[model samples]
Target chain A: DSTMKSAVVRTFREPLVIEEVPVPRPGPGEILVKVAASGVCHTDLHAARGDWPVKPEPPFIPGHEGVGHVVAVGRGVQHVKEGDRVGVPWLYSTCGHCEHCLGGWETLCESQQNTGYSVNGEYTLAQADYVGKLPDNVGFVEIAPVLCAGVTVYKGLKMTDTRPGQWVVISGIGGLGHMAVQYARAMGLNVAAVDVDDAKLALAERLGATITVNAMQTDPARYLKQTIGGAHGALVTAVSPKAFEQALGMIRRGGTVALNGLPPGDFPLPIFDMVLNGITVRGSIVGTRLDLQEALDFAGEGKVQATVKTEKLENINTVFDQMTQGHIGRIVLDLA
Target chain B: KSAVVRTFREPLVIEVPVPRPGPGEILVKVAASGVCHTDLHAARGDWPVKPPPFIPGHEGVGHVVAVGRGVQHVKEGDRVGVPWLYSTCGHCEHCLGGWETLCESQQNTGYSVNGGEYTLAQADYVGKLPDNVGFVEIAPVLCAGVTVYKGLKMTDTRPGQWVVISGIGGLGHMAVQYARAMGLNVAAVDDAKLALAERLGATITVNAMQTDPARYLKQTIGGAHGALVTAVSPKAFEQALGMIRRGGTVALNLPPGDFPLPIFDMVLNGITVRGSIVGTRLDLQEALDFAGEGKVATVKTEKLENINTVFDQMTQGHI
Candidate 1:
């Protein structure tokens, strides 16, 4: 057994401690991987702060968006081989016999297991069972941000049935929103990024967004309606309830609003207004294995890249503080 | 000439002549007709009081005994069913898209234009029925059956999903059987409809009086995959929001009512609430295809001569 270092949360509201933990062994249908890097997502912040509906117990190791190398495989494991590089995200495993799993929506399976929340995750040096085999072409650092953020936005985009050249608005151009803009541009959609700050708007423009709206100054709904004759669909990454409500208003008749954010509170929806206008509102969780692989393929085509700020593992507390204070863009932790 | 009319005051048998068909219209010989609650609304002047002398039937099953020039779909001696959407402007947006029910320039049977409570009627927008299905069976299918069928189709549920039909009365009962025939797991909800819904092919019956409908439904069918609200009660509308699963739909089919939806619940849970008007001629054809000979049987039938008596029974909740 190998001894590996990890950043573990001993209790809620306590600091993350870098400690040595035993490397886990692979079980049936599983593979063991040595992690190189893991991205610090807002979901991790939620788990750390205990803001989400289902918080993990204290002393839990937290990290889901991770990229690493496969070292071993368990019995019945055929998808990956030793020395294969991989990325692991939130959706660890699902009961393959459930109706949801049979319908290819394993993310919604009732017996699904989450990587960081349910068990020891990629925050450690070595992890097993939750690791996914990645292609040789995708780099570890490049695929790290995609493990959680990229898959969620990609799945949300597919849910809208939106195609190229159509206008799609991304609300809140932060970590998730920036990735969404890049993905939307790669898919041929005319992307418009909505943010409150000028710097974020400039960054969004640099990231290939066709237009940037200063939501603090102007009404986004009216602007989108007048600009694109109403957007064909909208992807909401902002966890503001008002932003979710505004996204619904920006869509045209028969348009869709795909929500991927865990808005802070219960938001009121205009039911009669949506019904009369033929609007659809849907929710999306994380993507499936096939979805993650497709995202990696998209990344390999040179059309998508994660604009991330890297820091050392010791700066985890500082990164969390910045993220909680609404600092925009993605932050990845380097174990080395 | 004037038509024999049923009004709020009385039933006056007035002298009238057979109406002539327009360029795309056809003249029908009314063989049998069904009395709907909408007709009762017209007879009692509840719906915007129309002309005193008016024919009061929206569901007419008859033969296209005569046709105007340029009519190709239906020929002379072809059987057809004249529904509530009597005529629609073919040039409008809705009509151009084949949604005649949403057409702005549309006429309703008995309410907007002269309808077939009489012997002979003229219709420009009529659906031709198959030769095998009788006129009596086609009568209720014109409005009640077609409505529930369209509502069920609007939910977009798969074959194995649970479809809850609330209020198993005249319309809900029809919905229960139609959902069963369409390969859905049927759940019927009403206070006194357990036995009747069972007889009408409902696999599960929910008594709203004894158990909390939303809680019981979640416990019974793992939450309804879709819901068809045939009952117009405000309470049913409220409970339907909590009865469906995530990404499921709840279609409202009854006439306009001031019912408030639980908006927060619907959005957060990914439930859809859509309004479904009656089926189009194409949707009716699909419904008929599903209900063809040896496939599905009609449950109840009433004779044309007992129209007024049936109306009285319906008003007294006896039918």
Candidate 2:
């Protein structure tokens, strides 16, 4: 029981290797977690490939959506006790005294460590103050994606500042976009889901999206503008610059475009049109600690749930292959 | 007599018949007007909109010399100020919602119609002057002050937070005071305008010509909570983006061209970039209220006869 099985990224651009590592013990201000379920996110793929501008070093764990029960509490950890259920999010820990951390924006804290990126995961040692408390009603497998992808979309929707009856265009009806569609519906906002796949568009409509557009077939901007005026806000979850540019053109004046995707490269934004139309482009990172709580609450109430395909932790390399070949639904590692 | 844009890139001060006011209109005897870079754009036809052969001056502060039929808001001899928002479709959603500045079919005083002496204004559109503020003192407040105040408000930055007033020119100079009056720490950015910014209520100054403003601000005060970018350069806008802290806001007013937005950094930091335009009537009222209380003032004043030279000086970056 002292050693735990983990999917380790031994090198960039190579398949992860399953290895037996020593189960980490909680230190000061830390809580040792027995992970029940861990979700594989797109970011995990990026971390493994080392493709992004900032990359995690090789031989690191590649999962931020780990959900588990706290098996041990370290010294000075008072908020959480042993045998308590919690979640390990992408935000592992932040300098509690920094302006961003103290100001309730801990996800943006510069002195922060990510759970699977900078630190290790799989029977992980998480910050006691940073771990999210689990809702008793929600299962570990059901809420695993909420630790990262669900919270990310929920926070992006909040950043849009759209009101009831106003339309929010969700570009990319995939993993994060599907959850955003449901969250937007629950928040009393209409959803317009955009994607290149017709199957995803059909699924988006079934998921409470008011309308769906195949961006590959028609110009989404002109279509949205001509129909129902325009979207009050747009949450772009697609990691393509074209998707980002198309979303920028799909909003009305005073509309906000909240960016959630992390596509690398320079986006040449037209300043003249932005100023003339009084539009706003906001970049929203993953949710804060409070945001994670709110996101879980939505899932606990059955307002949102991830469509996940379960796999064993030893088969992570095969899961990665399927994901690289354009797997649509989410994948969860059964770590229990 | 009025100052008119005779052609593209040229303006002429000529004598002409003073036009009479129509229904729901009022004639103002222009005493002073503020010159802006938009006036130069109007003269040179820089924008796709606004053709030439029109007068250029939106910050017209004067007394009403004539009132047209059914005009009850203001009568003859009442002091008023004509701003950029000449008129708007009053029943539109933006106008009814108090965001008349975004009205699509709205008319602009300097660009669409004649503006200097004997200017015609929609009776309901002009701003009423307070007894404490003079026409000359509040001329720039009609546009420059009100624009910056609106941009600052768009930031949504609470008091005791830091705000960077980039490009301390006509708009940025008054931005320092507005930010100070609103109880924000002001970091004024510019080389030649640092002294003026300090003389105003700027808490700190960054000479962009010598030092990198983003590095200085990040090292000094952690980073600005908000930034108001009134500079005409794209580099200044990019610099404004760099100097703000995570979860910070940057309200932009000027559009130079296409600017590069780092998608990775922006999303990682959760930064907000807002494109702000001219102020609404309500924003103007609040800005003038600050001026009426002697909280804001103009840095320089010039005669309409020397307006061409003023535009030239604007190009030299010495005004």
Candidate 3:
């Protein structure tokens, strides 16, 4: 059939509608992917509700972590061939002329188009000039969240000022924070995971965290400062401006606070603390193509595994609501 | 200690007994001296820590007339220059990491004990000044000049990248010259100092009164690699965020104050906001060497007696 079943956003602050739309075709230097699974990320929810100032207008598909098989290839597409298993990620294409692009920082190109937000996405079919290739050993559903949550945290961990044997803190041991703990540990860093949920922190400890702190019970910043002379790098994945601000205080002088979560509104950065203490604060988006490859390779090597609970693609709104309520593990859509 | 002390809001006067060279210290006969804005501030009691009844000079060149016991680097009769950084704890992470300026236990030469004193040098703290740059010019350059240099280095901007030096004041103008000397593409912004930037051979000058400098730099060079905002113009610091590209730096050398820093912009763009104090001995030596090599120059010179008038003129925006 030319038309395929899909989820489409028609209005902000409303549940997405399931519809039969004509399958999107791949363009020059692009390929079409049949959706097998999609990661239900917080960014997808943010886009659906039009939460950001730079919002994706209504009537757009919302999925950047859609993983599937390449079904059709467009003209001049050589990098990806038909029947290759690939994940259609957030970064679709970028202007190769920009300085960021020339320097291999294509993710920062202003002319870049995102898969779920700017371009049409994978409820049924995905068109992409760029996509993530899965290793033969990895599964689609488990690696689905790796396309966003996994790559994002990996980049955040890399952006930190810490080196191997140094301390790195993961604030909020939920879906992303849990993954960050593993990534930081795999990179040979001593991990300190902080979260309100005792169960999640326990799981993170089991997963290789050096120590776990209940942010619910004590001030993680003051505690970490005393325990480890402050973390060498702090990856803030908590979706709160308040929590993000507190993350900065958890690091020692000349340390870095790498931000991965995008909470609405501006986070108040104390100018004096940033400058006087020689602290560095950096915002990291999802990983670049190179970053995604490294993240997936690490996962394939069993360094990181995306902990997921499966849900039907049809119950997206409920899944989103559950996500907003917050979940310790990731939720992957069973698009197949 | 026969030093010039600001005995309150009153003017300074000279005294006789030559300040003794203690263990690890050296007493020098001063030749050329540098007057700075902080010297004026110290005398006026504007900053938090002090008032008066203290010597006010931190930058000057001197001949070591006498060396105290345990002084190893320079012998008696060696030429040396004194700077503001009196003593750092030397064991803190900052001192070990080449960031002695941030050492919490640091004492100010011109501010702390035996402080900011004219013609005084700690043998360990003061380094040998270059031959070409005169004593008077070396003192002033190390204060304002090293500040901009250190701030620029923190920007992490590679050489040949565009960096905007906001304000053409003492530090601002010095930044432009140092930027050129460091092989960087320079842009400057100031209302009346646009021509000063031009005279300094700044690649471009944005009149702060006419247009937004950040937007102009972005339009001109895609985006600046860093911002050295010497003067603490609240709006200019705010605008500096817009001037830089992703992963760029905005270095602040001005006194700490409240400024609206966009949290989203910072994390999203990978921009860095850094605070740096006065330069280090390493930084001061390089800045003095840059001036010594004829890359940058002093703004102006004045006599010690004219310091009262110079401070007055400085307060009134004169010389």
Candidate 4:
């Protein structure tokens, strides 16, 4: 058959329907990827429900963390070749003329397209230059979630500028936060993990976290300050607005807080403390091409691994239902 | 009691007994004192702490006329300056580690002590002024000059790089000179202050009132490697953030209102936004050395009797 089965979002807040769609071919500066595995992210849930301010049109595939091998290469594509392993990240392509693009910040370019949302999916078409080259030993399913979740937190940790031996707090130990804890530890920073669930906190302690705080049992802000004095930086992965604000107080003077979660609403920053203490608040999105490669290299070297659970393509609706009920671990679909 | 704040928002000129130098202190016959915006903040009770009938002047420069017992740093008749860091507990971890400004027990001149004509100062805290730099000129450098100098240092921008000075007023004018002296090109942003910026060796000037400085900078020097925001407006901080290149830093000198930091651009571009407080004693020494070398000069000066007039002009944004 010349067709591939895909999970499509036919309507907002509705179950994803399985449909057989014609496989796409590579265009100029593009390559055709036979996706071996697709990772489910919270952003995909938002795209399926159309809850965000920028809504994607229905009857489209919703996935940004797909890892696979190149099956076909189009004209003007020289970096990637047929049978090469790669991953299609969130950034599909960017307008090269904008100031952000000219300055090497292509992620901030306003005229940029996103994978799966702007284009189609599963047997997806991706820009050659924007895709990440997978290492030889990297597994498709294990590195699928790393394409989005792992790289997002790794970029956030780098934004902190926290030196080795300095303390860094990883807030909200979920899919992203768990990876943040591992990366912070691998980067030689003392890790302090904060979350509500005792189970998640225990998992963090098992994964090289120097300390873990249960925000439900006690105030994390007070607990972090009293124990470690305060961290040099904090990477917040929790989508709760309160979790974002509390991370600010857990840092020492002249410390930074890297914002990763895009929780809706205005973050009320305390002006007096921000100026007096020389605090920095940075909002980090997904990583650059280089950032993604470096993130994969850490996993390739066996320093980081995602705690992923696997399922088949037909069980995607049940996965979403479980995600709706606060599934703590990450899930990757077996698409191959 | 010269230029004393009898109440908030007003400086009253009256006569009182000149205070004597206590142990580990020295008394200076103040020849000139620079007017700073912090004086306005102190007079208006804008900050959390209020002055209780205290004479307000941190940039006091004069001859040290008396020294108490065990005062070994300077002797009588030494040209000295009273700066913002009046004194600190020298034994604290921050003080021992060269971050005296962050010490909790630190005392501020004019705010905590009587910093006026015949003002008393801790012998270890006063700046030893160079003979080449005049008292009237070096007074402003004690606070405003050291402030911007330290702000530029925090930018981490190196030689041949471009740095944007967001405001071209008193502090900004000195920042341009300091940046030039350090071998960095300057992009000055101001409306009425462009004339001074051009005369002070600024490589490029943008009237932020008319042009979008962010776009203009990108078109000219690619973008600044760093930015030091000396303007008091919140918009200046925001615009300065947009004026730098990727991996650039925006250092704030003048405190502003609630800043809605553009988090998306900041993280995506790897921008660094930091608040730079006033310099420590070592930084003050370097700032004075620059002025002593004839690299920096003051724009205007006023007499002690016309302190209220200076305050009035400052309120009208005439600084």
Give DockQ per model, in order: 0.01, 0.01, 0.01, 0.02
lDDT of 4 at B285: 87
Please, what are the lDDT tens digits per residue for candidate 3 over residues A1-336?
Answer: 356778889999889998878876666766767788888877888899887878886799888888888888878777777888888888877888899988988889989988778866743344454678898788899889898888899888878855445688888877898788877766656788877789888998899887888877888888887888888888888757657766888889999989887766665767998899999888898788888887887787677886889889778778888767854278888855
Candidate 2: lDDT over CA atoms? Answer: 0.82
Better of 2 and 3 by TM-score: 2
C-alpha TM-score for every candidate:
0.52, 0.53, 0.52, 0.54
- For candidate 2, what is the total of clashing residue pairs? 0
Per-model interface RMSD values are: 16.1, 14.4, 15.5, 14.6
Query: Which is the better candidate, 1 or 4, if ranked by TM-score?
Result: 4
> Model 4 chain B — which ten-residue stretch has the worst lDDT?
B254-263
Quantify all predictions' global Cα lDDT against the true fold: 0.75, 0.82, 0.77, 0.82
Task: Itemize residue pairs with steric clashes in candidate 4.
Answer: none
What is the Cα-based TM-score of model 1?
Answer: 0.52
Candidate 2 lDDT over B179-233, as tens digits, reads 7766567886735579888989786887877889998998987878898988857
Q: Residue B75 lDDT in model 1?
A: 73
User: For residues B121-147, what per-residue lDDT tens digits would candidate 1 score against the true structure?
Assistant: 344567778768777766777788888
Native-vs-model 1 lDDT? Answer: 0.75
